[PDB]
Structure formats: C-alpha cells, structure tokens
Design a protein around this ligand. Sequence first.
Ligand SMILES: *[C@@H]1O[C@H](CO[C@@H]2O[C@@H](C)[C@@H](O)[C@@H](O)[C@@H]2O)[C@@H](O[C@@H]2O[C@H](CO)[C@@H](O)[C@H](O)[C@H]2NC(C)=O)[C@H](O)[C@H]1NC(C)=O
Ligand SMILES: *[C@@H]1O[C@H](CO)[C@@H](O[C@@H]2O[C@H](CO)[C@@H](O)[C@H](O)[C@H]2NC(C)=O)[C@H](O)[C@H]1NC(C)=O
Ligand SMILES: *[C@@H]1O[C@H](CO)[C@@H](O[C@@H]2O[C@H](CO)[C@@H](O)[C@H](O)[C@H]2NC(C)=O)[C@H](O)[C@H]1NC(C)=O
Ligand SMILES: *[C@@H]1O[C@H](CO)[C@@H](O[C@@H]2O[C@H](CO)[C@@H](O)[C@H](O)[C@H]2NC(C)=O)[C@H](O)[C@H]1NC(C)=O
Ligand SMILES: *[C@@H]1O[C@H](CO)[C@@H](O[C@@H]2O[C@H](CO)[C@@H](O)[C@H](O)[C@H]2NC(C)=O)[C@H](O)[C@H]1NC(C)=O
Lengths: 238, 315, 45, 41
Amino acid sequence: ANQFNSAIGKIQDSLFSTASALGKLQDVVNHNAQALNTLVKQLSSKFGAISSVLNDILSRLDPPEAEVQIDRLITGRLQSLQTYVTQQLIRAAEIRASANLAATKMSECVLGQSKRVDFCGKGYHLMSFPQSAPHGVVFLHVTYVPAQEKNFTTAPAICHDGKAHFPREGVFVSNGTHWFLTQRNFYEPQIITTDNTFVSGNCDVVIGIVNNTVYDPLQLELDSFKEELDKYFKNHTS
Amino acid sequence: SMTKTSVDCTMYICGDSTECSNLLLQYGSFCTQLKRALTGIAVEQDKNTQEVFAQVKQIYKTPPIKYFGGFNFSQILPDPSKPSKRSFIEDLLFNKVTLQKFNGLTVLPPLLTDEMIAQYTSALLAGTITSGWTFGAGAALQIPFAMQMAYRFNGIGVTQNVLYENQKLIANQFNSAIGKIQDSLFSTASALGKLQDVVNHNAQALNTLVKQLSSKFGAISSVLNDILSRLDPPEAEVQIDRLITGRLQSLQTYVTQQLIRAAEIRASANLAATKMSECVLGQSKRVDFCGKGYHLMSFPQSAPHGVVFLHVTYV
Amino acid sequence: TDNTFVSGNCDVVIGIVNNTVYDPLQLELDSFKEELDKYFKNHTS
Amino acid sequence: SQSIIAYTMSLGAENSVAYSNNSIAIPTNFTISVTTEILPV
Ligand SMILES: *[C@@H]1O[C@H](CO[C@@H]2O[C@@H](C)[C@@H](O)[C@@H](O)[C@@H]2O)[C@@H](O[C@@H]2O[C@H](CO)[C@@H](O)[C@H](O)[C@H]2NC(C)=O)[C@H](O)[C@H]1NC(C)=O
Ligand SMILES: *[C@@H]1O[C@H](CO)[C@@H](O[C@@H]2O[C@H](CO)[C@@H](O)[C@H](O)[C@H]2NC(C)=O)[C@H](O)[C@H]1NC(C)=O
Ligand SMILES: *[C@@H]1O[C@H](CO)[C@@H](O[C@@H]2O[C@H](CO)[C@@H](O)[C@H](O)[C@H]2NC(C)=O)[C@H](O)[C@H]1NC(C)=O
Ligand SMILES: *[C@@H]1O[C@H](CO)[C@@H](O[C@@H]2O[C@H](CO)[C@@H](O)[C@H](O)[C@H]2NC(C)=O)[C@H](O)[C@H]1NC(C)=O
Ligand SMILES: *[C@@H]1O[C@H](CO)[C@@H](O[C@@H]2O[C@H](CO)[C@@H](O)[C@H](O)[C@H]2NC(C)=O)[C@H](O)[C@H]1NC(C)=O
C-alpha cells in the first residue's frame, strides 16, 4: 500500500513536468488546427485570377470576362477543399485505430487483469485506472516488478529413493548446502516434501538431476507412532 | 518501415525557372502541405522502427560458452566475423531483399542504421535465451535453458517432466527445424515478398513521379525553356500554368499515396511491435498469434524494412 | 484420491463409469491394522 | 561554455547476463510500479 501510494503521488510529477508523454493529444489538436488554418489561408491566393476577392472580380468585369477569373478561383478553392478532406479522412482513420486500441485497453487492462505482455505496462499487470484527457484517455497501469534478485544453484529434479522428483509449482534452489523449493517470482524457501513434488521415473534419464532427501510427512508420523507402539510392546513383553 | 522521401516543389515543378516559380507562388501554401506530409511520414517511419525494435532497457550478451541444453542457436546468434555483427539468417535476409534524385526527389536515411537494428535484435535474443521472459518484465534473471523450456512446456499445459525425459529428442527436433529455416525462407516463396513489395512500390512511385515531368498536360511541350523561347510571355503563361497544374496534380497524387501506404505500414509496424512484446518477451496464450500450434518461444531477426519472427511451437 | 476430487453421488453425472479409486492412506492403514491384528492374535495364543 | 555536440546513438547499457549452467536468479522483493499510457480517442 505504501509503494502504491508513493507511485500514485509521483504520477502527478512524471506527467506534466517531464514532457515525454502527453504530446500525442497536443499533436492531434495542433494538426487539426493547422489543417483548418491552411484551409482558411488558401482563400487569399489568386490561383491565376486577377484578384482573390470574388466581389473585386465581379465589380470590375463584365459577366463573360468575369467567368474566367471566377472559374480560376473556383478550381483553386475546390482543390484546397479536396486536399483538406482527404487529409482529414486519413487522420480520422489513424485516430479510429487509436480509439479501437484505447477501447481494447479499457476492456482488457481496466475491466480485467491482462496476461498479454507489455500490453498494460512494463511488468506483470496488476490493474489499470482510467482518466479522461481532452480528446483522449490516460491509463495508469499498476504493475508488479521484481526488485532484489539473489542467485542460487538450481536443479531440474531430485533423486531421493531412485525416483526423480519434479516440482509441482516452483523451482528447486540451493543456497550452498541445503535444497529448498521456492515459487517462481519471489524467494519463499520451503522444505522439499512429497506434497509439492511429483514422481516421474527413475533418476537415470534427467540431465542435471541432483541428490537430496525428500521428506514424507505421512511416513514421519507413521514411524513415530510405530516406534511408540514398539516401545509399548517391548515394555509389555518384558 | 518504408523509405523516407522528401520533395522540393520548386525544383520538381518549376526547376531553375524564375517566372515559373513566380506563377507557382500564386497557388499559395499548396506545397508547404506536401513538405509537412512527407516530414510526418519520415518521422513516423523512425517511430515505427524504434517501437518495434527498442524493447530492451540494456544490450544483453550471451556468455562466451554457447551451450544451452543442446538447443543450437548458431544460425540466429550474431556473427563476430563481420563488419555488421549479423546472424547467418539476418545476412541471408539482407542479401536477398535488395532492389529519381535528378529532379527534386531526395531519400533520407533511417535514424537507426542496420548495425543498430542488429544490436537490438541480438539484445532481445540474448535476453530471451539467457533469462526467459524475465528480461521483459523487469530485471534479467538467468535460468538454464532446459529449465526455461520446462517452464514454457508447463505454460502450454504439458507437465515439465515431459521435457526433461525427452530433452535430447526435443533438442534434435528444434535443431532440425531451425536448420530448415534457411531453405524455407526463400525457396518456398510465399513469405519474404512483403518487404520486396514495399521496396518495389517505393521505387515505382518515385519513378512515376519523375516520369510525370515528360508529359505535356496539353501544353506545347514539357520543357519550361522550350515554352520560354517559342512564345511571348502572355501566351506562354497559359502553357506554363498547364504544366504547373499537371505537375502539382502529380505531386499531390504521390503524397496522398505515400500517406495511405504509410498508414498501412504503421498498422503493420504496430502489429510487429505487439508480436515482439507478446511472442518474444513472453509466452502467448493467444491462438495462431505466434504461429500454428501451442506457442513455446519466438526469436526476432532484422530484415530490410521489416522483422522476421521465428516462432517455435509445440504440435 | 490424490488426483481426483469427490462431488456428490453417481446419480447426476451422465456417463459416470465404475472403477476403484485407489487410496494410499487406506492401503497403508489397512496393512498396519492387519499386522497389528496378527501380532495381537499371536500374543493372545 | 555550452555548445552543440554530435555523437553516435547509445542503445543502452552493456549488461551481460550471468547465464551459468545450473544457476538461477530468484527475486527476493518487489516494487509496485504505476506507469502512464496516453491514447488519443
Ligand atoms: C546420487 O546418488 C546416487 C545413489 O546413491 C546411493 O544412495 C545414497 C542415499 C547413498 O547411500 C549412496 O552411497 C548410494 O550409492 C549415486 O549412485 C551411486 O553412484 C556410485 C558411484 O558411481 C555407485 O557406486 C553406487 O552404486 C550408486 N548407487 C546407486 C543406488 O545407484 C549417484 O552417484 C549420486 N550422484 C551424484 C552426482 O553424487
Ligand atoms: C542455507 O540455508 C539454511 C537454511 O536456512 C541454513 O541452515 C541454517 O543455519 C542456521 C545457522 O547455523 C541454523 O540456525 C539453522 O537451523 C539452519 N537451518 C537448517 C534448515 O538446517 C544454511 O546455513 C544456509 N547456508 C549458507 C551457506 O548460508
Ligand atoms: C553444463 O553441464 C553439462 C552437462 O550437464 C555439460 O555438457 C558436457 O560437459 C562435459 C564436461 O562435464 C563436456 O566435456 C562436454 O563437452 C559437454 N557437452 C557438450 C555437448 O558440450 C556442459 O559443458 C556444462 N557446462 C556448460 C558451460 O554448459
Ligand atoms: C549448429 O548449427 C550449425 C549450422 O547452422 C553447425 O555448424 C556446422 O558445423 C559442422 C560441424 O563442424 C560443419 O561441418 C558445418 O560447416 C557448420 N555449418 C556452418 C554453417 O558453419 C553447428 O555445429 C551446430 N552446433 C552444434 C552444437 O551442433
Ligand atoms: C523490500 O523493499 C522495500 C522497499 O525498499 C523495503 O522497505 C524499506 O526498508 C527500508 C530499510 O528498513 C526502510 O528504510 C524503508 O522505509 C522501507 N520502505 C518502505 C516503503 O516501507 C523492504 O525492507 C524490503 N524487504 C526486504 C525483505 O528486504
């Protein structure tokens, strides 16, 4: 909880003071504004006509002569409009791809926990929280990152009684003298028993198998009670 | 990615002609838009390559001894005996995939040279064969490749004891399958046509653009000076304007086609980046995403204007 | 019984078949009980 | 005396994975990392 609180506190600094991100939405706004500005400034061009104002062409020319200049302006402005619309369609397709991706991320990162790697952040996904930005969505991806790694000596299996033992879930490790069974992503040593290991064949096929004893709790309790019963029987006999 | 180009409207349309450029000025900012579009395409190509290949915090290297439980990665590991430290498969791809400047058309070089792409690919491969999926989700934690492959078998629902007892057979099967990858990449045709298609499409587009300069468009000739020294200024205005309109239409067509093709290449580059994140940096449970069969692992290899994923799966 | 779990009786599942699910604990306890009974019988007579 | 300098791109640190023959690195702690992902909609 403390680590998550610290990260969410640092979020407000790693968003607006470090630049980096938040430039995609600003780029979208800038591109749209630039397209509109170029379109509106294309109205001042002449495109070969005497003047860029239709009123000025009409007030100084007879109809038959003004047809040519008005037509030059019409052709130029139609070309500019067509260019604007085509660029807008291409940009709309790009933004639709981005919006489909945002919808997928909301469905899979926020509404559930995602197993897809790097889809919802760098690390193992824990969850995600949405926020709304102008013309966009901002996901805060909470992920779990392994922190302090220690290197142990590992083995693929254990041959205790001539039968190879494989881990049920986790790996065999050794710190130098003793052998434990820990989980994959967090060092939690546990004594290798018959509960967390399964037998598969003898120990003459696996490459790298090591020698260790595997504790059997059932046999331990059975031996204890058998020893007690044998002592009682010996006392009764003599 | 695809070839990043650039055009000079003045050079292309009204090359070294003063009173052709003077009339071109009357068309306004019709040619700042084309310059901005081509700049956007180039920057997007660099972004595509960076997103696909730059997925590694560090540049991982394998240990000098190249024994990984019997799996033989010699054809995909880098070759130090080359100027560009590329793998055998990468060298074959770079040699196989191989195929305007006179008039205003220039070709900009990619930000990441092929050596840097090869280094990135080697980093991803070294991480994925020396640390499994742990190098993509944090710090790189080593694990013997036999144990990592047992992990991956456990991922697809087969108990790890299957791999250990058949480790030699699995290693031989993988070696045989990786040895056939050098022949099946080119002889079978099918794939590898996409990158060559991209290069050929760029060459065709540029050639058509520069060949549009030889069309009259209804003018007396397609040469500015020929119009200049044959007609008086007021009469030559119409012919020069016809040429300007034709060449502007050619340039607009080229830029629009480039924008559409760049959209398609951006979609493909996003897919390739997703495949690198999911198939290479981890193990995928998505069906048919990382090859037919139950996905075990993947290995990237750079190719001219693209990437090649070798998908190892269990059938 | 180690790799199978029990849920209800056999009158609900469609296609449930007959077989003996081996129980290692029961086998070991029965063997020990037989040995103890034989020892007690020998001690008595 | 600040000035504009040109260099060759550095792709990151040069870290060689200590891939041994029977050694594995297990993490012993963790971190809860909250990253950000901005998408035009
Ligand atoms: C791993 O152990 C096996 C088995 O060791 C046997 O059981 C032990 C609990 C202990 O009592 C040992 O003395 C037993 O031998 C080893 O296999 C033995 O190898 C030696 C040397 O070649 C041979 O003389 C014995 O006959 C073998 N015993 C059996 C039961 O096969 C094996 O060598 C050990 N491996 C390693 C790497 O130490
Ligand atoms: C490897 O770990 C084991 C288990 O923690 C260590 O053995 C312990 O040693 C301490 C100190 O003498 C004893 O108090 C414990 O009872 C021991 N535990 C067991 C289960 O025997 C062992 O010392 C460690 N090895 C190294 C090299 O650090
Ligand atoms: C890792 O262990 C394996 C065996 O589990 C080694 O494989 C053989 O090791 C012997 C020496 O013990 C060498 O003479 C052989 O050449 C090795 N086989 C092969 C095919 O090379 C392996 O060498 C060990 N070490 C490393 C660094 O991988
Ligand atoms: C991995 O495969 C490569 C081939 O891709 C093997 O290299 C061959 O080795 C043999 C035996 O020395 C030579 O005759 C060939 O000329 C080599 N081929 C090439 C292309 O160099 C390599 O030996 C394999 N590794 C293992 C461990 O088997
Ligand atoms: C795991 O890492 C956390 C975070 O660094 C460690 O907690 C810190 O411990 C130090 C030393 O006692 C304190 O000064 C910090 O205030 C702690 N941070 C927090 C957020 O509580 C923790 O000790 C580490 N765990 C292990 C087992 O090493």
